[PDB]
Amino acid sequence: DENKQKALAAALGQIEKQFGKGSIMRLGEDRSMDVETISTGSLSLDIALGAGGLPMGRIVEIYGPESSGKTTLTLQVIAAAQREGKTCAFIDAEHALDPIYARKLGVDIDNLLCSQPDTGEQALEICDALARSGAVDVIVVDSVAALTPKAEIESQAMRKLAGNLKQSNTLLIFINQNALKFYASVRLDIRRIGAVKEGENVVGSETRVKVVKNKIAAPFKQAEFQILYGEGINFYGELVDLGVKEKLIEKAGAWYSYKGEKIGQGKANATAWLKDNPETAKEIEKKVRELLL
Amino acid sequence: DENKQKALAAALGQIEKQFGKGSIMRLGEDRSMDVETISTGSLSLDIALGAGGLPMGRIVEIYGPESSGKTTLTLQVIAAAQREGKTCAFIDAEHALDPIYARKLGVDIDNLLCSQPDTGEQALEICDALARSGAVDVIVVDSVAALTPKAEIESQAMRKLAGNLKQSNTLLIFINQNALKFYASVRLDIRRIGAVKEGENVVGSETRVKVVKNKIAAPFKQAEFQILYGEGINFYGELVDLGVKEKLIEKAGAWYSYKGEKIGQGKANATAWLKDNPETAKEIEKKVRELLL
Amino acid sequence: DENKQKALAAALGQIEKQFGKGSIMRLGEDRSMDVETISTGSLSLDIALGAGGLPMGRIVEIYGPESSGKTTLTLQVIAAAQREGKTCAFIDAEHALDPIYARKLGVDIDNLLCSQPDTGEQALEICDALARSGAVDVIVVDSVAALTPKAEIESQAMRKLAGNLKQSNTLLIFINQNALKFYASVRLDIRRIGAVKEGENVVGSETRVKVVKNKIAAPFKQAEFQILYGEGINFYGELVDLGVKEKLIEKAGAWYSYKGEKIGQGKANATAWLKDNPETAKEIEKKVRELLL
Amino acid sequence: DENKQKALAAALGQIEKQFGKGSIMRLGEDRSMDVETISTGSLSLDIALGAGGLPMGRIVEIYGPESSGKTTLTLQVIAAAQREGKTCAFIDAEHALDPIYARKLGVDIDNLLCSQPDTGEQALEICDALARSGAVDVIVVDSVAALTPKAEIESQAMRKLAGNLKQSNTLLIFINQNALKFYASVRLDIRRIGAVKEGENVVGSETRVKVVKNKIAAPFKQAEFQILYGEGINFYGELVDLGVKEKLIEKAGAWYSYKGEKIGQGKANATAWLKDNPETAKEIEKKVRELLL
Amino acid sequence: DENKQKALAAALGQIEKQFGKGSIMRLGEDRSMDVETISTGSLSLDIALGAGGLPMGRIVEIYGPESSGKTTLTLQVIAAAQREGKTCAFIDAEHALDPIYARKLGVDIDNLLCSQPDTGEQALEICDALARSGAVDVIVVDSVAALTPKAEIESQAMRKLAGNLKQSNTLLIFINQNALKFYASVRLDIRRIGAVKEGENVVGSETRVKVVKNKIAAPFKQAEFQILYGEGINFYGELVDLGVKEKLIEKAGAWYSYKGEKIGQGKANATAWLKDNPETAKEIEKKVRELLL
Amino acid sequence: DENKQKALAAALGQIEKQFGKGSIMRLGEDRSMDVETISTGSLSLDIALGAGGLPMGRIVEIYGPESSGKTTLTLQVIAAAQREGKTCAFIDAEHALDPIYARKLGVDIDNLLCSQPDTGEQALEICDALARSGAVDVIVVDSVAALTPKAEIESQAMRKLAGNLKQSNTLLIFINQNALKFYASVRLDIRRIGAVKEGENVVGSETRVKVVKNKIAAPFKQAEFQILYGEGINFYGELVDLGVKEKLIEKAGAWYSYKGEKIGQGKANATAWLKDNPETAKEIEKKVRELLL
Ligand SMILES: Nc1ncnc2c1ncn2[C@@H]1O[C@H](COP(=O)(O)OP(=O)(O)O)[C@@H](O)[C@H]1O
Ligand SMILES: Nc1ncnc2c1ncn2[C@@H]1O[C@H](COP(=O)(O)OP(=O)(O)O)[C@@H](O)[C@H]1O
Ligand SMILES: Nc1ncnc2c1ncn2[C@@H]1O[C@H](COP(=O)(O)OP(=O)(O)O)[C@@H](O)[C@H]1O
Ligand SMILES: Nc1ncnc2c1ncn2[C@@H]1O[C@H](COP(=O)(O)OP(=O)(O)O)[C@@H](O)[C@H]1O
Ligand SMILES: Nc1ncnc2c1ncn2[C@@H]1O[C@H](COP(=O)(O)OP(=O)(O)O)[C@@H](O)[C@H]1O
Ligand SMILES: Nc1ncnc2c1ncn2[C@@H]1O[C@H](COP(=O)(O)OP(=O)(O)O)[C@@H](O)[C@H]1O
Ligand SMILES: [Mg+2]
Ligand SMILES: [Mg+2]
Ligand SMILES: [Mg+2]
Ligand SMILES: [Mg+2]
Ligand SMILES: [Mg+2]
Ligand SMILES: [Mg+2]
Ligand SMILES: [Mg+2]
Ligand SMILES: [Mg+2]
Ligand SMILES: [Mg+2]
Ligand SMILES: [Mg+2]
Ligand SMILES: [Mg+2]
Ligand SMILES: [Mg+2]
Ligand SMILES: [Mg+2]
Ligand SMILES: [Mg+2]
Ligand SMILES: [Mg+2]
Ligand SMILES: [Mg+2]
Ligand SMILES: [Mg+2]
Ligand SMILES: [Mg+2]
Ligand SMILES: [Mg+2]
Ligand SMILES: [Mg+2]
Ligand SMILES: [Mg+2]
Ligand SMILES: [Mg+2]
Ligand SMILES: [Mg+2]
Ligand SMILES: [Mg+2]
């Protein structure tokens, strides 16, 4: 019993000492590695990640079918980073960025560095150079599948990239539509699981993200949220549901209320209220994070 | 005659003395090695295994095509072990565990240890460390085919692992989609042999498991059962068929009855009755096991 | 002339005296060594072997591509031996025996001894121990190619094995997919040379076995027969063709007849008739053997 | 001049007296030792050998890559010998003789003596015993490379063998895929130098044999012929070419004619004509031999 | 000074009187012993030999790796000798002479004497008998390494051979792949130092011969030339280079010219011109020899 | 004390008077016999020899494994002698001299006398005749081990040779790969102790020479230097190290400087500078010699 508990603790400790704190974990442990993170723009996903956002200095992979929300997520990560004065770069092989939508999500387009590489090797070399500069905080590559080998147009790189990103504390996200599978500290499976309709017209998509790999906190948690056309992740909608779940917001059938006052009849109205009262929303969000992180 | 019977008995005895009781057996012998086991969650498979479940302290291999039920089986083994207060670990290289489905199968996710190794060598070293701790009862590796060599990403280990697992009495299961082939005490070939439909819609799969290698009891026995989507192995369905086979449950055409009373018209209803009357089901299961083990 | 005939007879006699009766032979001689044999389940192969089956106390090798019929042949040898009350053992390194198919071929699975060795050395030692017991009549090793050396997993043996098998009169068959090449008294090359179709669907395979080495009777004879899925060697089909060849069964174009009566139109129907009239079939088989052996 | 011619003649005569007529020769001399021979089945090779076939009482080596035609040649030698009522033996270590193909080549399989020795020493002892009998005319050993030493399975012999073969006038051919190199009177290098196609399908092989050692006539001559699948050496094709070369058969562009009459348009048709008119073919063959031997 | 010059001249003279003119030499002396020679077929090698070819009545050794050009050289020596009406003999232990290639090199195959000895002792005795005849001008032994001692198959000879060859003025060349090392008057080290390609395909080999021992003229000179497949030594190519070196042929960058006229652009074309204009080539060759010999 | 010092001085003096100045010495004495010498081409070895080079009129032995640098050393001795107008002879039994390499080392090949003796006795007699001429300054015999006795091919000499060499003041070096051991005044043990690489490719060998016997100065000193392929002993490299050792050249970490100016960064560059500025190099060399000799 106690003897076995001590033997297990020691064994797990030796494993962590040899391979790192995130090398083995109990799926239910409420502990996370002390790591600097950048918000994904989704409250439920920041919670599912355990650390409250994506880890700096690491490689992250986000994959899923076209239109599942990969680009939207990375643009919101960039916006979050830029708000904190961080320098971001976008390595593009898709040729599909919409600056109007990006600005809507909060991205400072004017200060976003961008490269549209001729070959996959050039793209990786540019990433490594930005990584080695110690002056770039976030790099987004969209997408992996578009990176065509030079030889074709006419593993070793990943190892060096990972090392350089770690040394400079640079977060790098690969959007994908074994090297990456193994070098990534976080891998996200994102998919559209339904449509959001304001009556009879489709205005967005119901989205689900599974954290299939997580080396900074317990893996396999999931997040669900809506992505509204031209607006991005419906953060306040997530806050309504999580506020209720943590018993910070009461739901009397269809009426939602906070601290004894109604904020809206129906999730849509409750969401709008939080959005129009950001100072209070920030307090609820802060409370939710303290409880679930 | 008698002289030859004694010569054969002595020869087989010498073989067993030199290489172990399971080194040679008569395929029809109703004897099994005294070994501690953990249920697979399938009554027919526990029977096919001869010992009533998978043997602790040994290496087991379960292989078959994608979606044949390998993960489902290992999760039900984990659930069975945890119910008995055993400590389990999941070494993942697939990045595909669904905790919602796992909890449905009975797994205590919160207490499940999990590791997502960077390389095949790291995965094996972690297994060995858990094995040497003497504090881990069940280790599941999913999957063998995903374990990529470090050198690639940028036999000797099996021998030590097997020895350590034996010393600590730790069961280790490798999911695969010559080292393993020879070090494993039990090897299971699992495959989907049909679809289960509740009318016009597919709700599960007809499954067949062949015990192709068994060093704890006679090999080559087979098990057949259904795996229902979101529910796992249809144990009560197996109990209906085995109860009838052992003449514990009578089948009057389409009506099934127990001790003179009808439990259901059609296998589906009979199955539901056993499921809703677990105390009686446990008695029938106990009877079946005593007769076939 | 006569002087040369006597000189040749004496020389051949001296060779046989020094190395054994089967050390030299005329390929056309209708003489075979007096040796106890076990049927292969194929009438044409028993004939091609010259002695009417495989020789007890000797080593036999059967090799050919996967699915050529090696296992089927050895299972039918086991069934034939068991029918005569002989004790058989199956040394398995393939982990692929199907007891349902085996029982269909006539094998008494319950009484079949089985070993699934960890290493090639262990397998050979088990064979030798069974050989030295004087209580095992037939040993089948499947397969040679799967016997991995212990050193790898982490000639001298053949000599002793051959001697022990001879002393106990134990037949041992090695299934293979220079030691064996030279120690074997019979070596069979088996291959699939076509498909058998009952209309538009494949129901079996056309098979050809060449006796490439034979130390008990003249080598190089061949046998041709069908192996039907789930049924094994089509013995009665061979009997139809051989009965006709030896003029015991008449064939009037498409109609086959025996002793003035039609047994079937087309080989398939004639085969079915013999199968349903075993007492007569046994007489024809006996006649064929007396004529060709 | 004349003095030097006489000195050379005397010196060569002394050499021959001391070591044998074939100890030294002028490569262009049209003289051959009076020796009994057996045809190889190839007209060009019988010519290249100088004596018209292989010499009895001597050792011959035929070597070349697999499928070059070694076995085919030896089987045709056996057929030629048997046609003359000679007794032949086949010492086999290859376990690959096809009696159907052999009969096609003219071999009297029923009367062919055969031995499949356990060791290289046993094979040589059997050869020597057959050699000493004075009752065996031709011995073929296939192959040298397969003769494994007893010690391994668990020069002095060649000297005695050669002496015994000489005394009994027995021809012995070793098929190989320094002892032999030096004891052999004839050594043949055979190789496939192309494919023979009847349109778009391969039906045979273009073959070339070099007489690299010849102690009965001038060495280094070459022979070229085709070996057709299932038929053996295309003798009549050689006869067409040699008949033309010796101006016995005229070739008017594509039309071949004999004694003023066309026998075929194209080598294939001319060959067929000779084959269908053997009595005339034999006369042409006889003429060619008288001119080139 | 002068006194020392006279003392040295006398000492060297006494040495030569006691051991022979070639017993000591100045490496740069442009003097050679008056000896009859036979061309090697290589202009640069005849020059490197100092005497203009190999010396008659002496023993010569030519050694080097397989395919370096040893046989080619000896065949060209034989061709040169035969052109002058000399009688040549080939003592073969290699069994590899190609008469087609030999005729291409100029060898009169029909008149070439050949022996294929059973033992090394027999080969040497045959050489000695040919040597003592006084009727053989050139003897080539290929090869030394193949001469196996009789005792094995089941110095003193060299001394007698050398004496007999000297008395009859017979040149003997040993091809090798201390007796010979010391009895030989000339020893040649030949090796392939590159490939000759007519574009992208290999058509020959770049060859280098070092005169490591020379008792008829200064040793250690070297020769470089090409050996073209099926053609032998590229003599005209050597003539182009030597003609230029001796300023008999002018080279204006890539254009070669003789007596004011262009003979070709590039060495290949210049070579072809000399080959097609042999009467002029012979004059240039004669000039080169007079200057370098 | 003083009495003992005088007794020792007298005793050593009597020994020297009776057997020669070099019959006994203090290993540390900085005195050497007044003897004419010829440089070895190695500055460190000339220093280790004590006299500044090899002594004329004496016998020297240089031995070591193949490729240790024996021939290179003797060729550089010959070059040094010839530069001073001395007459040199090369007695060869190796048949391996490369005149291209020799000229590179400074040897005047054209004026080098050379003999390639048939027997060991002939070689020694030629050496003695050259020795007695009083007109040869340096004789090199390569090698001792190759000198085969006449009797074999089919001490007393050393005594006379030594006497004659002494009388004529002729230096004779025996290259070896008790007579010599005792008659030699200097014996050198040379060996390769490493490889010299210009990056990743081997360009030379690190060499060590031990003066194991020295009758002209204190024995047992050692020399270390590099031998570069195609260039010989790296003299300037030795000068850099010795210049530094004697504080004539300063080394500031990696920078070498002379008289206040940098000559190169790294030994390689410093070496190159001395090589390109021979007039200064000669002054440094002269200084080093005055200090260490
Ligand atoms: N340019 C855009 N303008 C308005 N909405 C957009 C735009 N791009 C994406 N969206 C919204 O985001 C959802 C997911 O798109 P996106 O993040 O581009 O998917 P992915 O990169 O996975 O293909 C869309 O269904 C849409 O509602
Ligand atoms: N996450 C899941 N949710 C619901 N059913 C599942 C889930 N995973 C597996 N199953 C059920 O189990 C069956 C076999 O799946 P699984 O055990 O994952 O196969 P394998 O691991 O061999 O690929 C599926 O066909 C399905 O019915
Ligand atoms: N389990 C089985 N069930 C039904 N038929 C089988 C089975 N195993 C073999 N057969 C039949 O035998 C044929 C040859 O198979 P087998 O004897 O196993 O080949 P091998 O051992 O040479 O690989 C198959 O093509 C099939 O018709
Ligand atoms: N059993 C056979 N049936 C038909 N043709 C054969 C057979 N064996 C050999 N041949 C023919 O002879 C050619 C050479 O075969 P073979 O004499 O066996 O070669 P080797 O003995 O040198 O390996 C083949 O390419 C084929 O055309
Ligand atoms: N039979 C041949 N036919 C065509 N070229 C040949 C032949 N034999 C030799 N050669 C040419 O001569 C070169 C050297 O061969 P050879 O003189 O036989 O070498 P060695 O006797 O030293 O082994 C070959 O690389 C080839 O270009
Ligand atoms: N012919 C040559 N060409 C270029 N370098 C040579 C030559 N001969 C010797 N060397 C150089 O001298 C080193 C020693 O060779 P050498 O003096 O011949 O050794 P030894 O005579 O002791 O066998 C070689 O490792 C090589 O670097
Ligand atoms: Mg670490
Ligand atoms: Mg941890
Ligand atoms: Mg996108
Ligand atoms: Mg561009
Ligand atoms: Mg990681
Ligand atoms: Mg044991
Ligand atoms: Mg047992
Ligand atoms: Mg799975
Ligand atoms: Mg085991
Ligand atoms: Mg016997
Ligand atoms: Mg017999
Ligand atoms: Mg099988
Ligand atoms: Mg045998
Ligand atoms: Mg004789
Ligand atoms: Mg002759
Ligand atoms: Mg063959
Ligand atoms: Mg012979
Ligand atoms: Mg003389
Ligand atoms: Mg001279
Ligand atoms: Mg050659
Ligand atoms: Mg000589
Ligand atoms: Mg003295
Ligand atoms: Mg002294
Ligand atoms: Mg040397």
mmCIF file with all atom_site columns, C-alpha atoms and ligand atoms in Angstrom, chain A residues 62-75 94 96-102 105 142 175-177 190 192 202-205 207 227-233, ligand 1:
data_model
loop_
_atom_site.group_PDB
_atom_site.id
_atom_site.type_symbol
_atom_site.label_atom_id
_atom_site.label_alt_id
_atom_site.label_comp_id
_atom_site.label_asym_id
_atom_site.label_entity_id
_atom_site.label_seq_id
_atom_site.pdbx_PDB_ins_code
_atom_site.Cartn_x
_atom_site.Cartn_y
_atom_site.Cartn_z
_atom_site.occupancy
_atom_site.B_iso_or_equiv
_atom_site.pdbx_formal_charge
_atom_site.auth_seq_id
_atom_site.auth_comp_id
_atom_site.auth_asym_id
_atom_site.auth_atom_id
_atom_site.pdbx_PDB_model_num
ATOM   1  C CA  . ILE A 1 62  ? -3.279  21.885 -35.800 1.00 0.00 ? 62  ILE A CA  1
ATOM   2  C CA  . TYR A 1 63  ? -4.929  19.605 -38.361 1.00 0.00 ? 63  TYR A CA  1
ATOM   3  C CA  . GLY A 1 64  ? -8.394  19.046 -39.758 1.00 0.00 ? 64  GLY A CA  1
ATOM   4  C CA  . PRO A 1 65  ? -10.492 19.219 -42.960 1.00 0.00 ? 65  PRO A CA  1
ATOM   5  C CA  . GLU A 1 66  ? -10.763 22.390 -45.004 1.00 0.00 ? 66  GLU A CA  1
ATOM   6  C CA  . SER A 1 67  ? -13.024 24.992 -43.369 1.00 0.00 ? 67  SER A CA  1
ATOM   7  C CA  . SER A 1 68  ? -12.799 23.434 -39.902 1.00 0.00 ? 68  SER A CA  1
ATOM   8  C CA  . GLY A 1 69  ? -11.298 26.605 -38.415 1.00 0.00 ? 69  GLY A CA  1
ATOM   9  C CA  . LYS A 1 70  ? -7.521  26.080 -38.497 1.00 0.00 ? 70  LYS A CA  1
ATOM   10 C CA  . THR A 1 71  ? -6.631  29.459 -39.999 1.00 0.00 ? 71  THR A CA  1
ATOM   11 C CA  . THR A 1 72  ? -9.139  31.247 -37.764 1.00 0.00 ? 72  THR A CA  1
ATOM   12 C CA  . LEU A 1 73  ? -7.502  29.740 -34.685 1.00 0.00 ? 73  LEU A CA  1
ATOM   13 C CA  . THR A 1 74  ? -3.982  30.685 -35.743 1.00 0.00 ? 74  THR A CA  1
ATOM   14 C CA  . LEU A 1 75  ? -5.054  34.250 -36.598 1.00 0.00 ? 75  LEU A CA  1
ATOM   15 C CA  . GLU A 1 94  ? -1.670  28.493 -49.294 1.00 0.00 ? 94  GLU A CA  1
ATOM   16 C CA  . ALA A 1 96  ? -5.330  32.541 -49.103 1.00 0.00 ? 96  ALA A CA  1
ATOM   17 C CA  . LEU A 1 97  ? -5.005  35.055 -46.241 1.00 0.00 ? 97  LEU A CA  1
ATOM   18 C CA  . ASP A 1 98  ? -7.879  37.561 -45.999 1.00 0.00 ? 98  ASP A CA  1
ATOM   19 C CA  . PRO A 1 99  ? -6.578  40.696 -44.204 1.00 0.00 ? 99  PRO A CA  1
ATOM   20 C CA  . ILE A 1 100 ? -10.112 42.055 -43.767 1.00 0.00 ? 100 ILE A CA  1
ATOM   21 C CA  . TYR A 1 101 ? -11.139 38.967 -41.796 1.00 0.00 ? 101 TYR A CA  1
ATOM   22 C CA  . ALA A 1 102 ? -7.796  38.979 -39.968 1.00 0.00 ? 102 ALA A CA  1
ATOM   23 C CA  . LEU A 1 105 ? -10.165 38.970 -35.480 1.00 0.00 ? 105 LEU A CA  1
ATOM   24 C CA  . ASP A 1 142 ? 0.070   27.450 -43.411 1.00 0.00 ? 142 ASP A CA  1
ATOM   25 C CA  . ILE A 1 175 ? -1.332  24.005 -39.939 1.00 0.00 ? 175 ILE A CA  1
ATOM   26 C CA  . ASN A 1 176 ? -1.983  20.656 -41.616 1.00 0.00 ? 176 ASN A CA  1
ATOM   27 C CA  . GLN A 1 177 ? -4.968  19.864 -43.835 1.00 0.00 ? 177 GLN A CA  1
ATOM   28 C CA  . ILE A 1 190 ? -10.193 20.268 -35.241 1.00 0.00 ? 190 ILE A CA  1
ATOM   29 C CA  . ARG A 1 192 ? -16.782 21.174 -37.959 1.00 0.00 ? 192 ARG A CA  1
ATOM   30 C CA  . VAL A 1 202 ? -26.287 29.599 -41.713 1.00 0.00 ? 202 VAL A CA  1
ATOM   31 C CA  . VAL A 1 203 ? -24.104 32.119 -39.885 1.00 0.00 ? 203 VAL A CA  1
ATOM   32 C CA  . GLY A 1 204 ? -21.372 29.865 -38.537 1.00 0.00 ? 204 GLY A CA  1
ATOM   33 C CA  . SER A 1 205 ? -20.141 26.407 -37.618 1.00 0.00 ? 205 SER A CA  1
ATOM   34 C CA  . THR A 1 207 ? -16.632 23.284 -33.846 1.00 0.00 ? 207 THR A CA  1
ATOM   35 C CA  . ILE A 1 227 ? -17.011 30.052 -35.260 1.00 0.00 ? 227 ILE A CA  1
ATOM   36 C CA  . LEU A 1 228 ? -19.191 32.797 -36.705 1.00 0.00 ? 228 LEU A CA  1
ATOM   37 C CA  . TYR A 1 229 ? -18.678 33.938 -40.283 1.00 0.00 ? 229 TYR A CA  1
ATOM   38 C CA  . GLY A 1 230 ? -16.711 37.175 -40.369 1.00 0.00 ? 230 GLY A CA  1
ATOM   39 C CA  . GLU A 1 231 ? -16.379 37.242 -36.585 1.00 0.00 ? 231 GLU A CA  1
ATOM   40 C CA  . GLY A 1 232 ? -14.306 34.252 -35.527 1.00 0.00 ? 232 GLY A CA  1
ATOM   41 C CA  . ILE A 1 233 ? -14.598 32.206 -32.333 1.00 0.00 ? 233 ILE A CA  1
HETATM 42 N N1  . LIG G 2 .   ? -12.325 35.397 -45.115 1.00 0.00 ? 1   LIG G N1  1
HETATM 43 C C1  . LIG G 2 .   ? -13.239 35.023 -44.292 1.00 0.00 ? 1   LIG G C1  1
HETATM 44 N N2  . LIG G 2 .   ? -14.355 35.823 -44.080 1.00 0.00 ? 1   LIG G N2  1
HETATM 45 C C2  . LIG G 2 .   ? -15.387 35.487 -43.206 1.00 0.00 ? 1   LIG G C2  1
HETATM 46 N N3  . LIG G 2 .   ? -15.400 34.357 -42.484 1.00 0.00 ? 1   LIG G N3  1
HETATM 47 C C3  . LIG G 2 .   ? -14.323 33.555 -42.668 1.00 0.00 ? 1   LIG G C3  1
HETATM 48 C C4  . LIG G 2 .   ? -13.238 33.799 -43.518 1.00 0.00 ? 1   LIG G C4  1
HETATM 49 N N4  . LIG G 2 .   ? -12.337 32.791 -43.460 1.00 0.00 ? 1   LIG G N4  1
HETATM 50 C C5  . LIG G 2 .   ? -12.871 31.936 -42.577 1.00 0.00 ? 1   LIG G C5  1
HETATM 51 N N5  . LIG G 2 .   ? -14.070 32.351 -42.071 1.00 0.00 ? 1   LIG G N5  1
HETATM 52 C C6  . LIG G 2 .   ? -14.945 31.628 -41.055 1.00 0.00 ? 1   LIG G C6  1
HETATM 53 O O1  . LIG G 2 .   ? -14.181 30.598 -40.417 1.00 0.00 ? 1   LIG G O1  1
HETATM 54 C C7  . LIG G 2 .   ? -14.713 29.262 -40.673 1.00 0.00 ? 1   LIG G C7  1
HETATM 55 C C8  . LIG G 2 .   ? -13.513 28.323 -40.810 1.00 0.00 ? 1   LIG G C8  1
HETATM 56 O O2  . LIG G 2 .   ? -12.568 28.849 -41.784 1.00 0.00 ? 1   LIG G O2  1
HETATM 57 P P1  . LIG G 2 .   ? -11.014 28.638 -41.651 1.00 0.00 ? 1   LIG G P1  1
HETATM 58 O O3  . LIG G 2 .   ? -10.423 29.031 -40.324 1.00 0.00 ? 1   LIG G O3  1
HETATM 59 O O4  . LIG G 2 .   ? -10.489 29.374 -42.851 1.00 0.00 ? 1   LIG G O4  1
HETATM 60 O O5  . LIG G 2 .   ? -10.845 27.102 -41.959 1.00 0.00 ? 1   LIG G O5  1
HETATM 61 P P2  . LIG G 2 .   ? -9.570  26.219 -42.330 1.00 0.00 ? 1   LIG G P2  1
HETATM 62 O O6  . LIG G 2 .   ? -8.303  27.137 -42.307 1.00 0.00 ? 1   LIG G O6  1
HETATM 63 O O7  . LIG G 2 .   ? -9.528  25.072 -41.364 1.00 0.00 ? 1   LIG G O7  1
HETATM 64 O O8  . LIG G 2 .   ? -9.854  25.797 -43.719 1.00 0.00 ? 1   LIG G O8  1
HETATM 65 C C9  . LIG G 2 .   ? -15.551 29.454 -41.949 1.00 0.00 ? 1   LIG G C9  1
HETATM 66 O O9  . LIG G 2 .   ? -16.525 28.394 -42.028 1.00 0.00 ? 1   LIG G O9  1
HETATM 67 C C10 . LIG G 2 .   ? -16.091 30.876 -41.756 1.00 0.00 ? 1   LIG G C10 1
HETATM 68 O O10 . LIG G 2 .   ? -17.277 30.936 -40.944 1.00 0.00 ? 1   LIG G O10 1
#
